[PDB]
Design a protein around this ligand. Structure first.
Ligand code: HEM
Ligand SMILES: [Ca+2]
Ligand SMILES: [Ca+2]
Ligand SMILES: [Mn+2]
Length: 335
């Protein structure tokens, strides 16, 4: 079926989403991989991961928005209020054509297409409205152990490979708003606007500093000024279960994107039954091709600054980015 804009879709029920996609790219993200995009991507996780085989939750159901009055009381959802201040108006204005679970997954898929190198993901629709808030304690925290993280993702059907890719890849295009005291938009990698493998490098370096004037639980030292490091990421890069996977993505941008894309789609299905869903992948914008060069060490760092953790292979012999040590700019906030 050809929609009013000229897009061909397999299922004409998808055409009603074309204006949503246009509104998101023009008016929420404004064609940029900035804070609005980061918030939409984070919201995918906080909505979808909040499901457990034994404790409940509906998964990718829109509960984080519909039942925000409850879910925003949960410590792990700190800062989701500010994300919803930017994204929530769009969810409401498009609530005539799609459920909130569908909206959140669409917005995350469209957000990725605003970022250099990020994959175009598959997108399906048909998720029913949510029944209840998620239980608390289903969203992983940055102070959770690797065993805890792997049990949560593993019990939901993710491989360790997918787990590392989706966490680390997301953190390629992301900052911390509620970790560094009184500071917002502190990136996890040197390039929060670029879906590259700098995150994997940046985290493997020996940490030497903390930004700002104190710490939050689940923060550790970082190696690059103007960035922050989560304990979870730190540990994922170093634990024997995951460290070789972490290392495997360094300077493997295409492989990391492919795995990331598949993991996001899997995440988008949590709590759902794939049988009742309709593919609307044609409505997703085209991706921006990765247009940067190889991964590099940050200025001033050398391979002796890498903390080797993978026993099977040495860390890749990357060149060092030329120039003086510089601080990474903070991300201007949408809210
Ligand atoms: C073990 C898993 C994870 C932990 C513990 C974790 C932790 C965090 C923390 C603590 C922040 C900062 C929040 C704040 O200061 O308000 C953050 C930011 C973010 N996370 Fe993760 N995260 C994980 C997985 C993921 C996944 C799977 C995705 C996406 C599907 C994701 C996407 C993001 C994005 C995009 C941001 C940046 C938001 C912004 O710039 O405003 N996270 N994460
Ligand atoms: Ca949910
Ligand atoms: Ca990056
Ligand atoms: Mn933010």
């Amino acid at each position: 079926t050809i929609c009013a804009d000229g897009t061909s879709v397999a299922n004409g029920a998808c055409c009603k989403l074309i204006p949503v996609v246009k509104d998101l790219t023009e008016n929420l993200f404004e064609g940029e991989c900035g804070d609005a995009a980061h918030g939409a991507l984070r919201l995918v996780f906080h909505d979808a991961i909040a499901i457990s085989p034994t404790l409940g939750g509906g998964g990718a159901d829109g509960s984080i928005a519909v039942f925000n009055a409850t879910e925003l009381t949960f410590h792990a959802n700190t800062g989701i209020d500010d994300v919803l201040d930017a994204v929530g108006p769009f969810l409401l204005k498009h609530s005539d054509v799609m459920t909130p679970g569908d909206f959140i997954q669409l917005a995350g898929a469209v957000s990725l297409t605003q970022c250099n190198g990020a994959p175009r993901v598959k997108f399906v629709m048909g998720r029913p409205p949510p029944k209840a808030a998620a239980p608390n304690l289903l969203v992983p925290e940055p102070f959770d152990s690797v065993a805890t993280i792997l049990q949560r993702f593993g019990e939901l059907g993710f491989t360790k490979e997918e787990t590392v890719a989706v966490i680390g890849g997301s953190h390629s295009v992301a900052g911390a708003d509620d970790i560094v005291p009184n500071e917002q938009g502190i990136p996890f990698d040197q390039t929060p606007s670029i879906f590259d493998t700098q995150i994997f490098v940046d985290v493997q370096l020996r940490g030497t500093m903390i930004p700002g004037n104190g710490t939050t639980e689940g923060e550790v030292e970082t190696a690059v000024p103007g960035t922050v490091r989560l304990q979870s990421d730190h540990l994922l890069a170093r634990d024997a279960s995951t460290s070789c996977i972490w290392q495997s993505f360094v300077n493997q941008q295409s492989k990391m994107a492919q795995v990331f894309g598949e993991a996001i789609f899997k995440m988008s299905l949590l709590g759902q039954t794939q049988s009742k869903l309709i593919d609307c992948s044609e409505v997703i914008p085209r991706a921006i091709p990765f247009s940067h060069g190889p991964a590099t060490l940050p200025p001033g760092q050398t391979l002796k600054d890498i903390e080797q953790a993978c026993a099977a292979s040495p860390f890749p012999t990357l060149s060092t980015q030329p120039g003086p040590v510089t601080s990474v700019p903070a991300i201007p906030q949408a809210d």
